[PDB]
Amino acid sequence: IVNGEEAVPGSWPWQVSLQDKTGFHFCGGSLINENWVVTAAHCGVTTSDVVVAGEFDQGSSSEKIQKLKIAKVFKNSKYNSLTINNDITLLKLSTAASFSQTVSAVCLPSASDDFAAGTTCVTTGWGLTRY
Amino acid sequence: ANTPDRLQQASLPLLSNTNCKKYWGTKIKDAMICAGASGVSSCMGDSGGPLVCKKNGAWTLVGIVSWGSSTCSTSTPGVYARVTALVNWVQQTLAAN
């Protein structure tokens, strides 16, 4: 996030880091319950990648995190790799996340919800702060 | 060049489709929602993370970080997967698995 700010640690407890088997962060995602993460289809997640829950400082070797294996990847079959439309994938965890002060789920909307233009919303992540 | 160690956040406004299309034109499709162009930008490593808005006091997933300016410009709209258009697929997938 360019021109964002540091979050209060643990205050976005559904935010996960998607990492390869060496620990390299390549995408974010959101817990929607103890067994499932929602992320983007173009992230290309496989069952070799891992979901890291409870993280704040990826440079802190001593932070208490949950490194969760992925049992199955559910890419929306309508993801359009040309137009980027329908860019969503679900990850089913092989072991449930353990919810806590720093790990819990985001709510999902109903298909009919209207979120008005101009509403102040929030986005979070460990992406670049300068391109 | 490298990602921040510590989790970042930014507040930003949802944009109407009409205003988003003033920049991106016909690249904006029906399962996309735009936000930002407000001095902040999602960027490489943010993809797949959340865009949340309050609904009756509870943070609710409205977008999934998807794509945008290829230099992460803070004055152009960021584009997010529109969760309202995709949540029936989410619920069906959970129910079957």
Binding site: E5, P9, S11, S104, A105, V106, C107, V122 | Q9, S11
Partner: peptide, 11 residues
């Protein structure tokens, strides 16, 4: 869901 145990602080 959607209610953090630690409240976010946003400028």
């Amino acid at each position: 869901c959607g209610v953090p145990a630690i409240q976010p602080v946003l400028s």
